[PDB]
Design a protein around this ligand. Sequence first.
Ligand SMILES: Nc1ncnc2c1ncn2[C@@H]1O[C@H](COP(=O)(O)OP(=O)(O)NP(=O)(O)O)[C@@H](O)[C@H]1O
Ligand SMILES: Nc1ncnc2c1ncn2[C@@H]1O[C@H](COP(=O)(O)OP(=O)(O)NP(=O)(O)O)[C@@H](O)[C@H]1O
Ligand SMILES: [Mg+2]
Ligand SMILES: [Mg+2]
Lengths: 161, 501, 102, 470, 232
Amino acid sequence: PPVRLFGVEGTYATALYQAAAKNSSIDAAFQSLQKVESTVKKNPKLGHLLLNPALSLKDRNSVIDAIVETHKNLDGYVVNLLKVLSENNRLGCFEKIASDFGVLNDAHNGLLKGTVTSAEPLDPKSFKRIEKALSASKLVGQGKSLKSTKIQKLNKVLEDS
Amino acid sequence: KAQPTEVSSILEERIKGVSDEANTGRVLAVGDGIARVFGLNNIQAEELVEFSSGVKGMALNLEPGQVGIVLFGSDRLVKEGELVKRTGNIVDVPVGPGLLGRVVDALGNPIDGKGPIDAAGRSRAQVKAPGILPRRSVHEPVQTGLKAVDALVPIGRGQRELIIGDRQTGKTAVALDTILNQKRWNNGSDESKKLYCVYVAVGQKRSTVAQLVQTLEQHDAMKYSIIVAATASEAAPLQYLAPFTAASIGEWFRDNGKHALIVYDDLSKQAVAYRQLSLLLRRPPGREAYPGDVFYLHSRLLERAAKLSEKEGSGSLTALPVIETQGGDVSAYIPTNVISITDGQIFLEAELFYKGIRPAINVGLSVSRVGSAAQVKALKQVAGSLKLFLAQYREVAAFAQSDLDASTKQTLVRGERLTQLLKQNQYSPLATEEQVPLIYAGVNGHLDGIELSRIGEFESSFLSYLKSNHNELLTEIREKGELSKELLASLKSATESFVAT
Amino acid sequence: LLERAAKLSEKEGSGSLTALPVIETQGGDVSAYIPTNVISITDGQIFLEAELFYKGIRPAINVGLSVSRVGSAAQVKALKQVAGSLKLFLAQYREVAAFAQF
Amino acid sequence: STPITGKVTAVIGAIVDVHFEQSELPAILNALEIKTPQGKLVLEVAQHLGENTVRTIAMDGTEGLVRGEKVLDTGGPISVPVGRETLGRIINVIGEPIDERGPIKSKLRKPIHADPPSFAEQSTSAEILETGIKVVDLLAPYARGGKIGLFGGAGVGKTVFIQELINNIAKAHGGFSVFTGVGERTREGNDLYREMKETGVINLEGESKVALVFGQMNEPPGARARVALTGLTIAEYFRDEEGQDVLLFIDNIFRFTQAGSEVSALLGRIPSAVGYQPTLATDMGLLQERITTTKKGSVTSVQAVYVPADDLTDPAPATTFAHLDATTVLSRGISELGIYPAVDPLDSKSRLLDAAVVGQEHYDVASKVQETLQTYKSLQDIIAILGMDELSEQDKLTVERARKIQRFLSQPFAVAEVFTGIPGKLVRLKDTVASFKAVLEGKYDNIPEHAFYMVGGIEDVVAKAEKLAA
Amino acid sequence: PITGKVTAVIGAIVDVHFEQSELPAILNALEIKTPQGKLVLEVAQHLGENTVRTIAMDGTEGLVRGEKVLDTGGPISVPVGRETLGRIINVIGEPIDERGPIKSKLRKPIHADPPSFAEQSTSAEILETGIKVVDLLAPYARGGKIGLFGGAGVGKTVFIQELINNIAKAHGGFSVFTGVGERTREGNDLYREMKETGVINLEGESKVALVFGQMNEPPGARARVALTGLTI
Ligand SMILES: Nc1ncnc2c1ncn2[C@@H]1O[C@H](COP(=O)(O)OP(=O)(O)NP(=O)(O)O)[C@@H](O)[C@H]1O
Ligand SMILES: Nc1ncnc2c1ncn2[C@@H]1O[C@H](COP(=O)(O)OP(=O)(O)NP(=O)(O)O)[C@@H](O)[C@H]1O
Ligand SMILES: [Mg+2]
Ligand SMILES: [Mg+2]
């Protein structure tokens, strides 16, 4: 897909997207990737045991296989993601692989970017011109607390003259 | 932090399947004569490999994910993703006498349009030097024909004498006259007395090599010489390899009870080549950007030269490495290493050269650690005085500018004549029995009478006269190799007769 | 930059641009990187020297080393006429003044 | 139309990375094109970085380049027009005209990278090419078919010398000639093009005897690094396919090495010594070895060699020596004496100075002249310290003769009239040897030193001797 | 028996992988078996992820990635004691004089601890050499270090042999001659000259053990030989 996403560190999630895009296997991969991060960050248990430069090749593979058999959504192609990072010493940056998977689904089936204040709506219609015009009018009236760009430009012009 | 091998293209292959190909390697990247390759997992260090396009290369860095192969040809031939095949082969070379009179590249290929080499076998480019045990002390002369060298800087068989000087001083000329002088024996019958020539040309203009060929053929020297050619324009690996490649060619003769001599022209340029490879492979640089093992490079090469012991067939390999100083700098990184490996140096200087003293041998700076032991006993007989006289002549030299006492006057009288006697036109090396008379008449003061310009025509006329009227004494020197108490009065008498006439 | 200085042809209006770059050395060394670069880029140099200065030659131009490669082409004819050979002569002068030290 | 497209992914100075679809990369040394607002921008593939990305070098300025911009594969190396159609034209690195005389209408173009002739294609000949220049023809005579370098630090007279050569050689020469301007002064080139017209060598409404290839220092490294091969290819074509005599003039070949230097690091190579690229030796080799007489025809080349910081042992020139049949070494010390050309009579060498090629007498004169000056050089210690007074009589004469000789080696060039106001004198090789012979045997000991300075043959020594004594 | 795998080969630098906390300490001897005999590798660094970086004691041509590597569980060790006299030994404690193995009673690591500040000599003291010049003008330290200067043509080896003899004869202590960066020619000379002078006695007893480490050997070898001998 034309998304770039770096080229060395960002290629971890893009590599498995090619095999997961067959027979409708992209939907189940979103909810399974979130369970790996959540049970390691806010668990204090398997984080300190895996981030160290000890263990072994066989010990890292057995720990991933035992966790995945009792957790939600890990019986398809999810087991293969953890194995690749165990042997190549890449288990320390698990948040980077899960973050770069979600950006693929939201770029080819939705909008992104921003506008002003907080976030925009991020519609999944078609073209960006017909989406942004119909969403700007509906989000300006509803909410919009406004808590300056025009004032700053006027002041600068008068001090330079 | 980051690494190579699996990246983007190579990283999107193991996610779908951990098999794909059951095998060979794949070029990850290529440039500057280097190609990085994935796989080839069973490859040996320094294994030759072959690319889809047909260019060969060798594997030098074996890294976790990738192999680092150096190219033998233009890397325009190589592309990313290309297939690479092991040849399961450490660089070797055909060796044996079917090579005599041939001009090969560094891999043993024929470059002279004369068909396939007939190899008595093959030897790896890299080989252990003969150890502490299977060597004898150097004891047979390499007679170069050059008066100055044979008389004052005697070379032994198995020795490693280094030829050194700035550019354009005469370095090749010294070597080439050694080669040209072997006809005396190589045309004869007696094996133990012949000497086969091996000229390793490194990063020379091909037209030069061509002409060096056209020069030995003009002296019928080709028939017993081998040119390994790694010309200016060829891949650095070939320039790196050529001397080891040729080294193993020499050892054939060494190992087989015969004798070769090997000229490395030059080691300066080999070191430059090694450098290119390393830097590109991004091996860490030291002094002048050479790798740590640049010494080890040259030690390995020159330690292979030797005089083997009786048990080993008593064969021998002699080494004439050429080293090119820059503005005379012997402290320069490479010259340091090499000078400290060799058994001495023949030292050239453009100063002496423009004076007209050719060969332009600095005598004061040239030594042969082997020395005495390697000299036609006869030449060593009438010349133990020669280094003595020319030493004292170097010390009273500046007195050449009105009121000098007869002692230091005399010293200047020998010196000029003696120095004159060691000038020698190119390509005309002298037979020993032709040197010893001239060096005799010199040292024992039979030229002091003669003027300094006539010392030219003196040599010519003396020798041709000695030939007609005293061919018998000349014959005894050539045959006995020593001088009788009678022979000394013979020569003395024949000289005093010619000097009077 | 320095190539941007040139003397245009008649077709192009005959306009010129003339450049006097300056370069500072250390310890008189002109063989250091940058000076070397520019030295060979320009149509000649004027070397100023501290030794000359303190003994009273000001401008402390070094005739020995200063050149204009255009030369007489850009001198005024009158100046040219009476300056015939001066620069060579001034060289011969340093020559005899070095031999004077004997 | 079967065109290959890529996109620009980086620009860092003169280095432009381009990205292409799956295993479909242009090979190393291929040209790429980018169609810009004014003209096109040529690239040259340098490495295959991997992941379908190539590192290129730009044959122009890289400002204005936008990442993600379409790149086009020409399918092969940079092309130049070749043959007789390049005669009288000025060409830039990328085989495009710069004389505004319309398009170079040749039948063939040719890749500027090509392989150097096999060992077995070589042709050795000891033939002698008379320059007209006294010191060369006497001491270090140039070889027809040879290669001939002119070493010199900045402003010692290389470009003037090389032009004096063109002034003489390039008329008497029956065949064709290429001149390559590699990183010199746009204005020098200007002069040449205006001289060629007036010497007649070029004729924009008729027959011309020379091709002009320019890539001056006003141009970025990539360009300055390939225009030698552009020129060199045009030569090659006359050598091999017009089967004939060429004269290849390169000024200045050191800028091929320098330009190599300026992008080396940006291509990610560790510097070698004196901060030169690791590939100095082989890169120079890979060019120089093409400039060569072969069985199909003969090239004869004159290459000016910049000697940086007047240091001859600088890796760059130090390497070039091995490549030349004849070396003319210009010296600041010489030139500072008002002795033009600035040739160092001792350090200059040419293989042809051998009795077998020039005869014994020539070789003997040439050797003695050298001994003379070598002695005179050796005695300059005793002259400074104890004057000229404290000398042997033979010595006093050797010095007298050496000084007379130093001067007879200078000579007014035609080209350099702007500098001497003295008319250009050309001397015949036999006249050179005879006059030096005479000088050497003392048959001229009475004539004052100044009579030998900036004159032609011994005629002119006598003429001046009297004209001054008047 | 601890075992690893070759993961990287770069000139005299080899990289070996291992299993969890089995990594040999730095300065350990690792062996790979070759068609000839054994290549020895000295450990320089634990790079992490169970990998050690080594420096070779010989060439590395022909090494294939993933090759067996045995840990000796120590530094390089040499034969020691009387059994080494008249023997030629190399950097890795091997006979190179083709007269069998040295049959020593022990073996000792070439890397060791300098005698603590306790075990120190409180007084400087002259070692008698028996040479007039020396003893009278430039007397030797006992347990001291003497810089010997001069190339050839000056009887260096004769003089060395004299001291080996005189230290043995007058005092009653042996000598160890170490050749660091040896020119092999001179190793063959020395060895012969020593036999000829009978400081080496193939039939009776020697006074000197010979430990050579010549030029042709790779940088690791040439660094350690001094210790190899010193240990002895
Ligand atoms: N004994 C001699 N008599 C006369 N001429 C000689 C002699 N030795 C060398 N020459 C000439 O001097 C020049 C230099 O000799 P040469 O063998 O090229 O030295 P070199 O170190 O190999 N120069 P190079 O290696 O090309 O930088 C050659 O052109 C020879 O023709
Ligand atoms: N034959 C000559 N007679 C008189 N002056 C000369 C002669 N040759 C050179 N010069 C002087 O030296 C200057 C430099 O000449 P030039 O040929 O441009 O040197 P150069 O070495 O080619 N400069 P560069 O190309 O940067 O190395 C000129 O401006 C002339 O004054
Ligand atoms: Mg040579
Ligand atoms: Mg110029």
